[PDB]
Subunit: 487 residues, 4 copies
């Protein structure tokens, strides 16, 4: 960064936006300058899309093993760049050492996963109901894929989409979140060093409503995979319809963490603190609504607050043991203030926390909450967390399902019957028994239901999203036809 | 004859009592009075499906299979009734509606056969002491919106497979084929499916359809119809983040190379391009012949076209072609003929029309600017284009916004596979018709022809979702608070 | 008077030899049945072989149709099958009802799946190459079955094997020939092409051995004793035919201290003693946590005492019929004799008269008891007390067998840890050891056999994969190098 | 490396060591009989020690996450890439392979190891629909246990590594006994595994006689599965011996593959393809084109071109340079057998078009026409460079000759006609089949294997996993119910 300018990566070349316009990226930690970055426009997006389109047929037609080879090369370059990624995830994104280390380790597994699976994505040989007929189904890549990503886990979320989409023979136009441009540029550095053919991967840094919208509305883009807010997702889905492009949407969550009366209460509290407050609660599968059985509610709350008190908030560059960094910007702090203020004025009891300074915001924990609190009705993408007390499992489920979202969820209990009945009844795309709500592996179907979006990503589920089935037959006998009937 | 909605286990009038009269495309005679439903009727059906959903989804698959096998039994008793309505309401010939009914029987059976066998996955976990599996869950209430050309088989493919995996259904048939829809509801009623699991609402697309597409308790919409309609449904669906399956028609190429049995190729081409008056999404709509056999192919093709018998499809079992579905279709076919003549096309045969009947109009001296090369021609007007080699055949084949199916006729294994690979379509057939279709294969298109696949387990993929579930068997330490 | 079914014709053995089958209930005559020999077996095999190409080559939908026809016929024949399963096999009403219901589902399951068995389209590592994998039927399949559940076991094998385009030579157990003949009646009425299914009734060492050793038989699927299975496996090697072997079990039922003890006892009694314990997946070794052992044993014996043993023909509520023959009674006495001599405590049972046997329950057993070391295919059951979960698993696995198994507990961690640790082909949490569905992989590990049967798993056993490629470009070859 | 810093030893429980008895044999080159190395002559004790070492390593290897095992295999891949030249040198001098043959085997071996690593994490079970209420029903995949791996001498590296890598990937442990004519290749494999640091006992190498070490592996009660490639007779004996403990087997037993050539081909190309397919590695390939079947309309021109290219083949010391076409057969016993085949064909009236001479272990390709079905070279697997050409009148005839064999491994047809290609493919009785390519096409992840006398099972990628794992049905029942006994209740 001290020797290179941040730039777009289009058709194998690093370069400025056509207008030359730029923005200054600052750190959420202390407001210091990180870099000037492109402020691209529609012409830049169009150039990337055309580059991706022109590269597509050669990239889709080579054998899978050759695409796997490029991905293994990418993996090798990533391993060399780990420290650079960690550094930027911390200073640009505000992530602690432990968070960004976790993100980089997972990203390494994601890239490897995509490389591993490329050669093995199979179609099907079918039984034909007709005689003398061969009937099979091939897998084909969709084409040019737009990749639009958020700021909270910008590396791992970007690379899950990019690596798997590339593995099955799509080409890519990537637009990172405006708050995390340097992470996207480092990804382009990685891809360039790995030597992928020009145009196969393109980076365009610029405003969502401009560059993103051009990607979503362009006729040469076949598919858009998007992670962000539910409202943005709805807009993208609607704009995508104009050219009938398919979409993958992961739109956040208000995941329930349900704690029953038979748990190890102290472990439950330790687990709950991690699940609800890691990365300052800025995780789509954060445990955003904690739901506790009344028989252990008092000890659980005391214990949860006890460990929350221990959380160390600081400049995440200071050392490896900082627990929480800042939120990404001042808008998030203002929003978390609204959440706290709304809860207090509604009669909610603030057990602990509530202070903020600059972009830093302390955990703010509430009890005595009801369903009309904003922190029960909206995704709270920050460290404000309600605890709800319930009398039985039926109530646990009612509260857990009383949300527009449906991403993940978890139950803690040692009873196999209660665990399975609750897992079945909770309306979520993912569910975890005796673990955190944000469990994620590189090759499992990650995604939600209801307002949390559509589709699944991870391993072959990513492949399902960015390929199509192609039924092909061969008929080995001639036959007579019904018209003209006179014959 | 009076026809009604079927909502929550009950046949009933629309809540406004409004009705309208349906006439035969064959002679204009009255057929039935059918509902003109409104949004309130749609909402009632939707609420009934929603209320029925939990009970229907949570019984074992084998029970839903049992209901589908019942439906199969009832359908078998209603075959002749379905055939008559498909002919008098839809204009189909005996041979056509017989085929549709036989295929429909297979579709219902296929859905029943597969219900118990739709599997999730057990995964390898990257973590110790973790069980990691993926369940299949039904999406919920599914809207089913269908066209008029093959109103029975298209409807039942969607309805039977959607029900099989534990979805409930709100069904709105095309306005030109309401009685077929009503008969479907009769069959379901007699199979005794629980109230609200299946609902029929007959009404205008822009009113009843739009309510289905925009309602927040509908989880998915599967649609077959025009690409323009599909695009608008997709846009409306976005508001509540419901998913869609869209089959939006085609302009399929039929490619004929120089090594064929030319007479056979002509016979095959006539059937593929003009069955059901070409009113088929996978009709062979653009015929592409190699120069070396073109003259002989064209002569033979027109020869067999000339032999086609056009008549009242009620008359006997050997009528080849019936009428088009309405006068709007006839007017559109005239636009296509008008455009082709004005651009220098040579009208080898056909073009005569009377009432809703139309004699297949065949053109040569065609180029890429003709409307019949640029648009889906959902009727009996067909271009034959001559190409000099396989590269050109492929160039012409792909020079379309559509991408549903396609076919190549040749005995050469290399040319067959190379062409199949290069043609941009969701489906492709070597040495057969463009409209090949089986009950359990992935049917659907690319480009403007739509999104998703239907048929057997592919239908299940469309109307279920994956649900990752884990069990962790060991406790561990967490990274925050670090002071711990 | 029953007969063979060979190449579409019901006929008597070549020799005309026959023998008289009697009821295990009272020794009365049931029927005269064939005593077939080698040449009868060879005739059946040749018929199946000649029918094979035409049967394998029709579209799957045609075979499904025949199976749906067989389902129709079976539905009409339910009462006949139930009658014969009771009087020939000694089964109670409730047992043979269960068997007939499951058999209906088995036939249906095979018909449902016939059209849907898929191969794979692969990615090629080479340019211009199409690479796919087809499924092909193995060919003529020998089916050799036991006497305990002669209908459902036979029909699971027969229906699924037919579905994917194999032809069948079927030799039922000598103690249950009439059931096999009724199966042949059903297939004849369903009108399957001649030679596609064949029945030969005769002695295992004669008819069975010819099936197992014949050139034109491609596969044998066998259910019976481990010793017989080992013999069949050895004989099969001569012609390189594949086998499926289901060889019984000594399944553990593990009961932990957090259960509903009364419910566990009720479950245990059903699991361990239904059909007089003559089930491959019977709960044959009951393993109970010390904290609930006293109460469990008390309630278990209480329910055992309530079992009504009688002529199974009398009415629909007889709990237990007789064992299949005198040999079984004699073996059960050997098991009782050994347990007593080693210090076992006989809590109840042991009485026997004719082929009837009152369930003998032992405590104070150790690992050297024959009823802990061998499959006890009858109503003699040990209960073992353990101090903790590690010991429960140790005892559960201390067996040559590995078919099924079960744990009763409400603790999710304990249930899963034990499920993982027990060495068996199948396992069930909070249910009986002998759970079985038509479409699940049924089979064991260790001495319990090889392969899996049920739905598509049956299809895997009696088909093979066939890799086919098409190469669409020419290339240069490395020899001769000078070229 | 140097054949004379070579000692060759067993590899058991993480250590390289001598056989229990100290017994050894001398491995000589087929090229000139030169000494390559003293190698172990192990006995049953060494086999038992290896088996006990694998058994004791099993639980910890099977229980770690698949990703751990994949990591070990990726490490093996890294080490293999460093040893490529060493493997090529030993395949040539020990096995008689030409440069081009051993380069191909080493390239394929690299892909095989990588393939096994790639697939480890992705072998899935199934979640099922239960017919019962309140029941969860799933199927897990579990490794079989200790796996015996017994291999041949013709492609000793790639065949061994296909078996070893995939078997290790899904959590089995391995006892490996290489062919006695290719021990140094097996030792280099153990060196690779050792340098990759796999846990002790997970992989073991025992070098010794098949009827001693091999039979102990096949009969031992703690061995769960044997995967074997060799002669059909050996295979039959192994299958019989394995029955004693009910262990399962994978058997790839050779072939007599048909190469069918129709009248519409490019005849010159068909001849070039046929030469490569029928004679590469001196025809010592299980999927060699061993019976050439040609349509009478192109038979004369095909035979002339085929014999022309055969005559062009350069036979020489494979160590000489990179463009040698054919090396020696593996030993003098193979030359003697090929001589029997030639003599039997001459004596029966066969027309010897070219070749049939031999010197040392080098055998000159012998091509016959005017044969019939009673010729040994039509009735037996001819694992060497003696090849019959049969002329047929039509496709029905082509298929009848192609199927007139006890074997059924692979097959190929050359034609540009799609109907003839597909009809012939469907009709030929083989486990594998290739339209317009060589009979011995092989990829790392496809199901390789035969039918009839050619064996049982499939190896390659997920198909190797199917062979060395079992399905395990597990249920959870979430409701109590009433039971039918005691009925009084
Ligand atoms: C299972 O089944 C076992 C008990 O049933 P079972 O008594 O019927 O077992 P079984 O004695 O092994 O007999 C099973 C089947 O194999 C046949 N058989 C016996 N010897 C044979 C041979 N040398 N070759 C081919 N077939 C042969 C039997 O015919 P025969 O009835 O004529 O002996 C019978 O049909 C238990 O272990 C349970 O777990
Ligand atoms: C394939 O491969 C064949 C040629 O290879 P090949 O000569 O190596 O075939 P092979 O003679 O059957 O031997 C293959 C492997 O099996 C071993 N073997 C021999 N007898 C055995 C026994 N009784 N038990 C266990 N293993 C035994 C061999 O060891 P030894 O080399 O020490 O005999 C060798 O490692 C071709 O014919 C084609 O069919």
């Amino acid at each position: 960064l001290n020797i290179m300018k941040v730039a777009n990566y289009i058709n194998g070349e690093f370069k400025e936006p056509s207008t030359g316009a730029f923005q200054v990226k600052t750190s959420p930690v202390d407001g210091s300058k990180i870099a000037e970055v492109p402020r691209s426009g529609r012409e830049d997006a169009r150039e990337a899309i055309d580059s991706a389109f022109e590269a597509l047929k050669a990239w889709a037609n080579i054998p899978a093993i050759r695409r796997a080879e490029y991905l293994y090369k990418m993996l090798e370059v990533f391993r060399q760049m780990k420290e650079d990624f960690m550094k930027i995830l911390t200073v640009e994104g505000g992530g602690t050492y432990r968070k960004v280390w976790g993100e980089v380790v997972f990203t390494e597994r994601l890239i490897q996963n995509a490389a591993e699976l490329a050669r093995h994505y199979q179609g099907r040989v079918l039984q034909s109901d007709s005689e003398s007929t061969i009937s099979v189904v091939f897998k084909r890549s969709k084409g040019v894929v737009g990749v639009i990503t958020p700021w909270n886990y910008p590396l791992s979320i970007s690379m899950k989409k990019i690596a798997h989409t590339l593995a099955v023979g799509n080409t890519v136009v990537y637009k990172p979140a405006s708050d995390t441009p340097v992470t996207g540029w480092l990804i382009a550095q990685m891809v360039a060093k790995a030597g992928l053919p020009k145009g196969v991967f393109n980076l365009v840094i610029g405003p969502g409503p401009v560059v993103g919208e051009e990607i979503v509305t362009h006729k040469r883009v076949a598919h858009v995979t998007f992670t962000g807010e539910s409202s943005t997702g709805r807009e993208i889905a609607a704009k995508a319809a104009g050219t009938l492009k398919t979409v993958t949407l992961e739109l956040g969550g208000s995941d329930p963490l349900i704690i029953l009366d038979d748990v190890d209460v102290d472990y439950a509290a330790r687990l709950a603190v991690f699940a609800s407050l890691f990365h300052q609660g800025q995780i789509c599968t954060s445990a955003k609504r904690i739901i506790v059985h009344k028989a252990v509610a008092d000890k659980f709350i005391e214990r949860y607050v006890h460990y929350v008190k221990m959380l160390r908030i600081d400049d995440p560059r200071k050392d490896e043991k900082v627990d929480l960094g800042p939120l990404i910007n001042e808008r998030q702090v203002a929003l978390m203030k609204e959440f706290v203020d709304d809860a207090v004025s509604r009669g909610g009891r603030l057990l602990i926390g509530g202070r903020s300074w600059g972009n830093f915001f302390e955990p703010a924990i509430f009890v005595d909450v009801d369903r009309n609190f904003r922190i029960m009705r909206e995704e709270v993408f920050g460290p404000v967390r309600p605890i709800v007390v319930v009398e039985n499992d039926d109530q646990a489920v009612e509260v857990a399902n009383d949300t527009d979202y449906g991403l993940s969820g978890a139950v803690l209990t040692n009873n196999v019957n209660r665990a399975f009945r609750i897992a079945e009844a909770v309306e979520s795309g993912m569910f975890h028994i005796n673990d955190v709500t944000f469990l994620e592996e590189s090759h499992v179907p990650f995604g939600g239901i209801k307002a949390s979006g559509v589709g699944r990503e991870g391993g072959e589920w990513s492949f399902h999203e960015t390929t199509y089935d192609r039924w092909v037959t061969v008929t080995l006998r001639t036959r007579r036809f019904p018209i003209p009937s006179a014959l």
